[PDB]
RNA sequence: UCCCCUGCUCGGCGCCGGCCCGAAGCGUUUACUUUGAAAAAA
RNA sequence: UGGUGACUCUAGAUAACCUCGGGCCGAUCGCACGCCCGGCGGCGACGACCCAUUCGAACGUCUGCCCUAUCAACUUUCGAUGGUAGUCGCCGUGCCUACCAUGGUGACCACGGGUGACGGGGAAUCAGGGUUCGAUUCCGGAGAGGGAGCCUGAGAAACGGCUACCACAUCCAAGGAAGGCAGCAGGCGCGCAAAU
RNA sequence: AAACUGCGAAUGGCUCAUUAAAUCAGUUAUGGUUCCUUUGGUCGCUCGACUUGGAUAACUGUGGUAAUUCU
């Protein structure tokens, strides 16, 4: 029974996207998940539920309301380029290195360390 | 160098006597009389007027048909006014300096729910603000020192979520009926 | 480009000069016209 | 220090740049091109704050790599270019153009333009040079050097190029009677007519400019700028028309406007 | 409340060498009084 | 020719110079391709003696600094003051050399000493006048134990660059080798006093 | 990958020891100098090969010192 309404909606062709601030009603229920959101805007957009992207949605006191930001684009590849990587890995298409800052450090350190084409083998 | 903001004020003002009998007796009555918790509320209630009179005095103090004067008195007496403790017949700058402090007591939420007859007492009033029963324009409040305005005095009503407004019963309510029927079945 | 707008230049020059040496026969004419009268 | 200044904090910053006070503790410092530090407008403060294109500082840097932005009619790749006062901003993509015109408050404001209007510039010399073998120069307040003018060019008088091949087409005289711009300090944005000008040997000269309502102020000599032979201008002006009203009048027209709009 | 009790080389609100007005240039210097410019942000 | 309130300004002509530890006058690269009888072309990147602009930096003008007389006179052929001619410096100039005259500041507090003194935008208190603090996030200055010297570089007397000294200090086959947390955490010492 | 080359490492960060017309503050000048980079100009203006030279990295192999980002 949550109804979704937009506001201060307009459409960057520079950016091939569309910027709007989402207004999301959901009285006597907690936060609705960024999922549905997707698919509602998927849905009164016209738009397959893969290049839509929604993110901080932050809860006012008295339950009802939850102001949120939504994000829409036109294809795949053109959604993957001028995409921050962390919402790439929230939907699940992207995935970074796992390793820590200090070993990353010391090692480079120990690249440092020595000379040559061993530069290489020393790091591991 | 970090990025914060540095910046706050103190609200109230301690007076210079601690212990002598009158203005004692004048701020417990008060406290008794609107149901505050301490000193400090009232007491930040008089730094405010105490401000707000300085100003004034500020601004009668220049001469007339200037453009700073007239631009900062007709904008405060329109807030004066928006905030409920003034009337549009009294509409001059000289006038401020006759307010008193139960004046600004009387826009406060807490006697404002008391006195438009949603609670019992005005102690009942501030345990009903605490515990977020109530809403001003469909929007909850949990503060008692929720100043008002002259048109938000009409708007305010009992929350969409709270027994006493229509809506899911309480804990005990809801206990006491889970009591019943298992002593029922 | 640097011989081509030389010759822009030649060409106004040329007429700025005119119109400031008729300018300033006008000029002496006026001085003869009220040293005359 | 041991060199020049690099780094720029957030309250180092001008007030027309206009930014907010918490968001991190740096301050885009813009890269070195015609304009001044103080009076510029950076590319990335103007996309990211003014059209609200993009929200962060690499989608910036994205829309200048994918080539989108011209400023003057060519492709500027730098992030923090300073475009400056009186200068073109031209999308391809879009189809807009901007012109970046002080209005009634001292600060930059967006201004729409056609793209008729968007192929010339105004300029103000700053000195006249002779070259090697009697070269008439230009030093424009742009960093724009121009090869033999008309002239009758002078120090004061402000000059029209064309875009495409940097030449003159006319120029304005500067005299008593003609339409004004100021640009810096405190009279910033204010349309008039020049009236009196007086000279200080040895000092800054100052002039009289008089508003189309009556009112008169007097700013410096070096921050003149002149826009229309007469009282009519020759580019598009902006809302307000530069008046620099007060704010008693400015608190009774938003008053009757929300009043009006309910 | 407001107009009046500063003088000799060039030129435009206007006329038939004559009237007036306006200017590249000048008038004992100080303090004080009033206005205007510039005087970073927080 | 041109401009400034003001040139020994820019420009013009003449007679030479033009430094091999030496000014310029493209022995560079990418992409898409071509027309016209081997020659002839587009859009860029990098570099370049100069010229202006920009970020500056540097040296100067006027005015404004806490306490102290149990500090009343101070500086000077070991430059203090000025002149002239120069060295050097990126330029002005006792910045420094050679020669001259005896100058320059002060009872309107110079000079000397002290400071539990970084300066300022500021903060507390406040009828009006005032008193005290400002190590502290913004600006400017100074230093990386303390003085001294230097390379590279446009810009450093740089210290997460080098070199000499002393104080301190690491490893060591005793021959030598390697250093500066007033950066972030953390340890010792210190102290009423300050964090992963 | 490694390595040669050009660039930036003189910014930022910490502290207040020295310093009392010194620093700093407002107002001025460089018509008494320098200025990486960016922007714009100049780059057949001069009257006399359709591409030149030999060295070095990285690399291979042989080594020393107890030890260094040593060679």
């Known amino acids: ?124 | 160098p970090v990025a914060r903001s540095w910046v706050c004020r103190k609200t109230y003002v301690t007076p210079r006597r601690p212990f002598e009998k009158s203005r004692l007796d004048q701020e417990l009555k008060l406290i008794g009389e609107y149901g505050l918790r301490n000193k400090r509320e009232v007491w930040r209630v008089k730094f405010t007027l105490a401000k707000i009179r300085k100003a004034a005095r500020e601004l009668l103090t220049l001469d007339e048909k200037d453009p700073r004067r007239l631009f900062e008195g007709n904008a405060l007496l329109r807030r004066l006014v928006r905030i409920g403790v003034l009337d549009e017949g009294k509409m001059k700058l000289d006038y401020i300096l006759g307010l008193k402090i139960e004046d600004f007591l009387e826009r406060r939420l807490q006697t404002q729910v008391f006195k438009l007859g949603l609670a019992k007492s005005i102690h009942h009033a501030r345990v009903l603000i605490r515990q977020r029963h109530i809403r001003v324009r469909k929007q909850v409040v949990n503060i008692p020192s929720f100043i008002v305005r002259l048109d938000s005095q009409k708007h305010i009503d009992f929350s969409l979520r709270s027994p006493y407004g229509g809506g899911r019963p309480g804990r005990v309510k809801r206990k006491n009926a889970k009591k019943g029927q298992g002593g029922a079945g | 480009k640097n011989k081509e707008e030389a010759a822009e230049y030649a060409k106004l020059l040329a007429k700025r000069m005119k119109e400031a040496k008729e300018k300033r026969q006008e000029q002496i004419a006026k001085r003869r016209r009220l040293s005359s009268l | 220090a041991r060199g020049p200044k690099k780094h720029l904090k957030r309250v180092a910053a001008p007030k027309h740049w206009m930014l907010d006070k918490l968001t991190g503790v740096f301050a885009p410092r813009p890269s070195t091109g015609p304009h001044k530090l103080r009076e510029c407008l950076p590319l990335i403060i103007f996309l990211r704050n003014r059209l609200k294109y993009a929200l962060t500082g690499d989608e910036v840097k994205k829309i200048c790599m994918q080539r989108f932005i011209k400023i003057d009619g060519k492709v500027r790749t730098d992030i923090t270019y300073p475009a400056g006062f009186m200068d073109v901003i031209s999308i391809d993509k879009t189809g807009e153009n901007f012109r970046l015109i002080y209005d009634t408050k001292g600060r930059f404001a967006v201004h729409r333009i056609t793209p008729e209007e968007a192929k010339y510039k105004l300029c103000k010399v700053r000195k006249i040079f002779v070259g090697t073998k009697g070269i008439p120069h230009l030093v424009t307040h742009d960093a724009r050097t121009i090869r033999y003018p008309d002239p009758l060019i002078k120090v004061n008088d402000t000059i029209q190029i064309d875009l495409e091949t940097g030449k003159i087409t006319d120029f304005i005289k500067f005299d008593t009677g003609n339409l004004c711009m100021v640009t810096g300090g405190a009279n910033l944005g204010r349309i008039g007519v020049i009236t009196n000008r007086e000279r200080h040997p040895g000092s800054f000269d100052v002039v009289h400019v008089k508003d189309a309502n009556g009112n008169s102020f007097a700013t410096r000599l070096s921050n003149i700028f002149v826009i229309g032979k007469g009282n009519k201008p020759w580019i598009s002006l902006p809302r307000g028309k530069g008046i620099r009203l007060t704010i008693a009048e400015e608190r009774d027209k938003r008053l009757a406007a929300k009043q009006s709009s309910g």
């Open chain 1, 1 to 124: 029974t949550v109804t979704i309404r937009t506001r201060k909606f307009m459409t960057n062709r520079l950016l091939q996207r569309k910027q709007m601030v989402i207004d999301v009603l959901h009285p006597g229920k907690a936060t609705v998940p960024k999922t549905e959101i997707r698919e509602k805007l998927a849905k009164m957009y016209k738009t397959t539920p893969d290049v839509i992207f929604v993110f901080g949605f932050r809860t006012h006191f008295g339950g009802g309301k939850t102001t949120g930001f939504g994000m829409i684009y036109d294809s795949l590849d053109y959604a993957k380029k001028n995409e921050p990587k962390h919402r790439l890995a929230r939907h699940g298409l992207y995935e970074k290195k796992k390793t820590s800052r200090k070993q990353r450090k010391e090692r480079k350190n120990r690249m440092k360390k020595v000379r040559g084409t061993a530069k290489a083998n020393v790091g591991a």
